[PDB]
Structure formats: structure tokens, C-alpha cells
Amino acid sequence: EVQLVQSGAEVKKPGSSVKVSCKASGGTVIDYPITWVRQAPGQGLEWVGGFVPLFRTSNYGQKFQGRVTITADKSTSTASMELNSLTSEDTAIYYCARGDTAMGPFDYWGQGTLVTVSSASTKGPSVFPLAPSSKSGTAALGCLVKDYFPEPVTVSWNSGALTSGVHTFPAVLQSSGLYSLSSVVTVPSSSLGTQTYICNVNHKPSNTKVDKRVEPKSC
Amino acid sequence: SYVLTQPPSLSVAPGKTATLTCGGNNIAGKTVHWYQQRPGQAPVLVISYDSDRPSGIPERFSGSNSANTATLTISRVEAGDEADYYCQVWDRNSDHWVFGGGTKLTVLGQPKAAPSVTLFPPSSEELQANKATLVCLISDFYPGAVTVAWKADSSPVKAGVETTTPSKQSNNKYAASSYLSLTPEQWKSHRSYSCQVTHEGSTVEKTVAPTE
Amino acid sequence: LADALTAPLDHKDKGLKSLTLEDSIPQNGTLTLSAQGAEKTFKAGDKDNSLNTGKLKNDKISRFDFVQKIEQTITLASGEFQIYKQNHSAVVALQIEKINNPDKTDSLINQRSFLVSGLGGEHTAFNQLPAEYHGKAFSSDDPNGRLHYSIDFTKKQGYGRIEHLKTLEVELAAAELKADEKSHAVILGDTRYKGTYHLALFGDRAQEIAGSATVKIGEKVHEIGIAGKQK
């Protein structure tokens, strides 16, 4: 029962760098072969490099040798990967993986860190309410999260308390270069007169936080 | 060996045996590991050291390695075995970890699911900001191929439509989104706007009018 | 486990509770082994050459990263330290992945070899002898081989089989149950369908065996480490 947990999403200009941190919950990453694997959109698993504790060093994939450093700091109790001179080809999810031996299979994994490298500007979202309609059999209301960049945007409802019946759809990358998503809640049509519904939208890339009330159509 | 060749895709009927291949120039000489990965989730080691099976892994899963082929073998396949399967080795000749390309395991026999469509008109606020967005959401359907079409009154509309590629969600079904971006003038100068979703020869049409 | 290096000997552990690595430490050298985020270094000559076998899992190959050093100071080899453990025996192998550069000392060339460098537990006295055995046989990158070896003591004969390796399959043939200098029960035989082999018996009642076999293929000799129990 050990659980690696990672440093949280990132946005980078090309030619910048990134440091991704990993720590374990029911254990430690220290003196453990930590390993960094990335996954780029539409592709699969790719090795970056990893710490070998015995030789007190790290190995790196021939594709990153020169611009990457995989280290660990026992004071903070955390492992770190640092990838310099970023390109949009470095956009990917980065997983830290622990294994008991330098050649042992990765039995524990972190949850990934989305690193988006781009030269386009970071843009926070415009959050609009989508009033309940019930056309489609319950009622549905939600939040349109329009023209942001880049991913990720997280969404919850009523500060995480409303989670039954909610569906956040995957983002569209529209032709402008901006993302849009919708988060929608199927609710009982009767309680509309007495329940409040707030969507909490969080775009860490732009440090934007929006709580939006979704009230029923006036009419 | 150093290069691992995984087919990119394998299809299997439920309850039959799925046989996932990982090819290597004398891959027998290496001891491979297998990971399963599900949509939106970190990988999980399903086999290690060739034909070793860790803690939580069902005994339907098992692995072997001989000549130039390692094989992850799943007996009696469930629907929740749909997943990407990566094979890995450590290449001493290069000091590299090597992953195969991955095999997308498709489980056949899954029943057609029709899409729930819900259509939202542009928000009052959004019009107060001199934009208008029509939102057409499509969930819970199978197979994952939808056609979205927009109408203003009866006339097709192609400019301003952004439609997502369908995304495999948690249950093996799919979700998709279409957005029709409008000028509020455009929005208000038409009796209605219509979202038309076609899946497996069946059509769902929602219609909303500026006269809300 | 890592505890095998960093925990005392609690009696109430699984099987063989400790083993000694003096046979894997180079003459006037070091052996350092690490896994699971613990490390321990094993200086040659010391009494502190014992590994807490008790902590590992039984009937499975346990693995440790390792590195051989001597005397400033130079590094000899590195790779994976492998140990198979039953209740009264254990076999240990070295999977050398890099070695010392024969030219550039203070440099390590890549080189894979496999050598059996341990054999211990509670040997059965050749006089205290009172069965069939099936177990594991493993060489480098090959830990799913299987061994079945049966003999009766009254004939005092020797014959068993090795299969399920990814490399060939070997015959453990026509071997006399003898007694080594330590008064211990110890089989020795030849081996073809390609070299020799040697077993050793362990356990209160000779419940287990553990030993090693060699196979001549062309010019390279593949060492295999075998071990099994009765039932």
C-alpha cells in the first residue's frame, strides 16, 4: 500500500525547462530505483531515464541525454525529473515509476503530470452557465468552459459535494487553437426550486478559479 | 530484444482466449514485463519476469516467452479487459529500458448503445458578452462513430462547427461534443437551431429557438 | 525483501532464517547488495557475512542489485544477486551485467555472465540419511525453468531432468549419492540430453535439494542453479 503522487500540471514556452516531482504516501521514493516514463498524445509509453541507487547515478534514454537530470532530494523526501530546452515534442504525461531493483519491473506508478510545451499564450477560460432544460428522463444543467489554453481544466460541483450524476465531457481543440469543454449534471426536475448548483472550474495553467451559479431560466 | 514488436491492435470475443504478442530478436534471452493501461489511468503491471503473476492480477492472465515471442495470454476475456497492453524489457546492450508500441485490445460482442443527446442554447450571459455558443453533448454510445450536423432552420451550417473525436470513457462506451459558435445576431435571426446526431443508422434531432 | 539486510533474526520467519555470502564476496573485497530502498555492504573476511534469508519469500527467486569491489580501490563487477530459498536450503546466483574493463581499469564494460556462488542451509549428514523432488531451475534471464529429480537412497543412485528453460530444455544422469568432506549428503553426476552437475541434500529428513548444473554449448558453458523439495 504505497502510492506515488506527482508535482501537478505544467505549461512551458519552448526552450524553457520543467521539474516534475514525485513522492510516496505509504512509503518513500528515497534509495529506490525511481524511473520516468512519458506518454505523448496519440502515442504510448516511452522511457526517459531513471535513478540507480547503487551506482549513485541516473541512466537516461539516448533521446534526452544532455538535456535531462533525474535526481532525488532526501530532505524534501522527493524525486525529481528536470527536462531542459523544451519543444512541443515534449508535451506529454510524465509518470514516475518505482521498482525494487534497477532491472526490476515498475510495480508502483504515480498518476502522471501533464506538461504542455507550446509557444501560444496561456489563456484562462470564460465560464458560462447552462441553465436546466429537461428536454432530454431528468433535467440537465451545466457549465460551458470556453476558449482556454492549454489543458487541463478541472471541474467539480458544490465544492466537490455534488458528484452523483455529473459528466464532464472531454475538451474540443477548436480550429482557433483554444479548448472548450462542458460539465453537465443530470438532476431531478422537481428540486430545481430548492437546490443550488455551483460549478467550480480550476485552470491552474492560468491560475484561474471560477465558481459559477447555474440558476433556472427566468422566462 | 531491443526492438519490441507489438501488433497495434487485437480483437477477441468474450470468454475466448486473447493472445497478445511481443516480438524480439531472441526475446527468450530477456525476461519481459507486461502492463495493462485503461483510459485515463496510470499503467498497472500485470505480469513480470516472463510468467509471473503479481498480487491483484486474476489467474486468467499469464505470460510466457520463447524463441522470438513473448506472449501475454488472457483466458475467458471480460469486457473490462479492453485496455492497452505494453511489453517491456531492459536492454543491457544499450543500458535502456524498452517498451513495445502497445496493443489495443478490442473485446467483441459488446452491444450497441444509443447516444443520449442534450442540446443547450447560448447562455444569457454569453450573449451579454456578444458571443453565442450552441452546445450539443453526446454520451453513452457504442460503437464509437457519430455524425453531427447543424441546421439553422432548415439550412445546413458548416462554418463555426467544432466537433470532438469520440472518446472511450470508463464503461467502454464513448462521449463526444459539438459546438456551434455564432454571432448573437446570427443566433437571433433564425427561428431555430438544430443538432442532428447519427449513430448506427439512427438519428436524434434536438432543436432550440431564440424564442427560448 | 530489503529486511533481509536490515532487520534482526526473528525466529518466527518463513523458512531458512539466514545464509552466508562469504562465497560471493571477492578475496579481500566487498559485496554491496540493495533492493526495496535499503542497502547493506558486506566486507570480506568479517563474521558479519550473514544474510537474513528468513525475511525473503519461500520457493521464489528474490533479487538484489549488487557490485563487487576490491582494493586505491576498484570495482570488479555488477548485476543482479539472485537467491532461491526453501525451508532448509537456498541457492544463490550472480548475474554479472558489467565487468571491469581489462584495459581501462576504473572503467566497466558491459558483459553478461551467470555463475552459481552459494549453497547453504542445513545439510543432511550422509550417515543420518533415511523420495521424489520437483522444483525450479534458473539461469540468466531464465527463471521459469523446472527441475524434477528422484532417487532412492538404498540403491544410492542418481537420475533427474531439467526442462522448461528458454534455451534448450538437460539430463541429470547416472549419479552416485556420495559424502563430501563435511560428512554431508551430496550427489554428483554428468549431464546430457552437456557437462556435469552436483546436488546437495538438505533438511531434517532430506526434504529438499539444491545445487547447480553446467551445460556445454559450443564454447560457452551455461551454469544453472537448481533446487527442489519432496512431496
**Looking at this protein, which amino acid is placed at residue C188?**
L
Facing C38 at nearest CB: one of A31, A52, A103 = A31
- Could you tell me if B166 and B145 are in contact, meaning their C-beta atoms sit under 8 angstroms apart? yes
Q: Are residues A56 and A157 in the same domain?
A: no
Out of C90, C124, C158, a domain closes at C124
C37 CB within 8 Å of a chain A CB: yes
Domain count, chain C: 2
Q: Are residues A138 and A65 in the same domain?
A: no
Q: Are residues A73 and A168 in the same domain?
A: no
- Could you tell me if B30 and B90 are in contact, meaning their C-beta atoms sit under 8 angstroms apart? yes
Cα C211 from chain centroid?
7
Query: What cell was used for C146?
Result: 523446472
Q: Are residues A128 and A111 in the same domain?
A: no
Q: Are residues A5 and A112 in the same domain?
A: yes
Give C38→chain A minimum CA distance, Å: 7
**Whole-number Cα distances in Å, C146 to B133, C135, C214:** 67, 6, 15
What are the residues whose beta carbons fall under 8 Å from the beta carbon of C184, sequence distance 6 or more?
C123, C124, C125, C126, C200, C201
Phi, psi of B149 (to 5 degrees): -145, 140
Out of A103, A119, A135, a domain closes at A119
Out of A82, A102, A119, a domain closes at A119
Query: Where is chain A discontinuous (C–N over 2.5 Å), named by the preceding residue?
Result: 136
Query: What cell was used for B73?
Result: 495470454
Contact check, Cβ <8 Å, A31/C78: no
Task: Identify the bridge partners of residue C223 per DSSP, sorted by sequence position.
Answer: C214
Q: Are residues C34 and C11 in the same domain?
A: yes
Using only C-alpha atoms, chain A has a radius of gyration, in whole angstroms, of 21
Q: Are residues C149 and C101 in the same domain?
A: no
Q: Are residues A135 and A172 in the same domain?
A: yes
**Looking at this protein, which amino acid is placed at residue A138?**
T
Contact check, Cβ <8 Å, B49/C112: no
Q: Are residues A8 and A104 in the same domain?
A: yes
Q: Which domain holds residue A88?
A: 1-119
What are the residues whose beta carbons fall under 8 Å from the beta carbon of B190, sequence distance 6 or more?
B152, B153, B210
**Looking at this protein, which amino acid is placed at residue A90?**
D
A10-12 and A113-117 strand pairing = parallel
CA distance B100 to B118: 40
- Could you tell me if A20 and A6 are in contact, meaning their C-beta atoms sit under 8 angstroms apart? yes
Q: Are residues A7 and A48 in the same domain?
A: yes
Q: Are residues C36 and C81 in the same domain?
A: yes
Give A120→chain B minimum CA distance, Å: 20
B49 CB within 8 Å of a chain C CB: yes
Interface mutation vs chain C, best among B49, B88, B95, most C CBs within 10 Å: B49
Which residues of chain B neighbour A35 with C-beta distances below 8 Å?
97
Q: Are residues C90 and C143 in the same domain?
A: no
Grid-cell match 489554453, residue found: A149
Which residues of chain C neighbour B28 with C-beta distances below 8 Å?
166-167
What are the residues whose beta carbons fall under 8 Å from the beta carbon of B201, sequence distance 6 or more?
none
C57 CB within 8 Å of a chain B CB: no
- Could you tell me if C6 and C45 are in contact, meaning their C-beta atoms sit under 8 angstroms apart? no
**Looking at this protein, which amino acid is placed at residue B56?**
G
What resolution in Å is listed for this PDB structure? 2.7
CA distance B63 to B72: 5
Q: How far apart are the first and last CA of chain A?
A: 54
Out of A119, A153, A180, a domain closes at A119
Q: Are residues C117 and C143 in the same domain?
A: no
Q: Are residues C103 and C178 in the same domain?
A: no
Q: Which domain holds residue C204?
A: 125-231
Which residues of chain A neighbour C38 with C-beta distances below 8 Å?
31
* Three-point CA angle C169, C174, C178, nearest 5°: 115
Domain count, chain A: 2
Q: Are residues C2 and C27 in the same domain?
A: yes
Length reported for chain B:
212
A32 CB within 8 Å of a chain C CB: yes
Query: What cell was used for A213?
Result: 451559479
Give the number of beta-carbon pairs within 8 Å between A and C.
39
Question: Which residue, A167, A156, A131, is CA-closest to B140?
Answer: A167
Domains of chain B in start order, with CATH, are: 1-109 (2.60.40.10), 110-212 (2.60.40.10)
Q: Which chains touch B (3 or more CB pairs under 8 A)?
A: A, C
Burial class (CB in 10 A: 0-12, 13-18, 19+), A196: exposed
Q: Are residues A97 and A53 in the same domain?
A: yes
CA distance B209 to C134: 78
CA distance A19 to C3: 33
Residue C59: CATH number of its domain: 2.60.40.1980
B137 CB within 8 Å of a chain A CB: yes
The interface residues of chain C toward chain B in range 95-134, judged by CB-CB distance below 8 A, are 97, 110, 112
Contact check, Cβ <8 Å, C143/B49: yes
Q: Determination technique for this PDB entry?
A: X-ray
Out of C106, C124, C142, a domain closes at C124
Q: Which helix (H) or strand (E) holds A50?
A: strand A45-52
Interface mutation vs chain B, best among A146, A181, A212, most B CBs within 10 Å: A146
CA distance A49 to A40: 16
Give B14→chain A minimum CA distance, Å: 25
**Whole-number Cα distances in Å, B33 to A97, A104, B49, B196, B198:** 14, 9, 6, 46, 42
Interface mutation vs chain C, best among A28, A34, A77, A100, most C CBs within 10 Å: A100
Cα B133 from chain centroid?
26
Residue A165: CATH number of its domain: 2.60.40.10
Residue C183: CATH number of its domain: 2.40.160.90
Q: Are residues A168 and A95 in the same domain?
A: no
Q: Are residues C142 and C120 in the same domain?
A: no
Q: Are residues C155 and C209 in the same domain?
A: yes
Burial class (CB in 10 A: 0-12, 13-18, 19+), B185: exposed
Which residues of chain B neighbour A130 with C-beta distances below 8 Å?
120, 123, 135
Which residues of chain C neighbour A100 with C-beta distances below 8 Å?
2, 35-37, 63
Question: Which residue, A208, A199, A212, A217, is CA-closest to A163?
Answer: A199
CA distance A30 to A163: 36
Q: Are residues C149 and C210 in the same domain?
A: yes
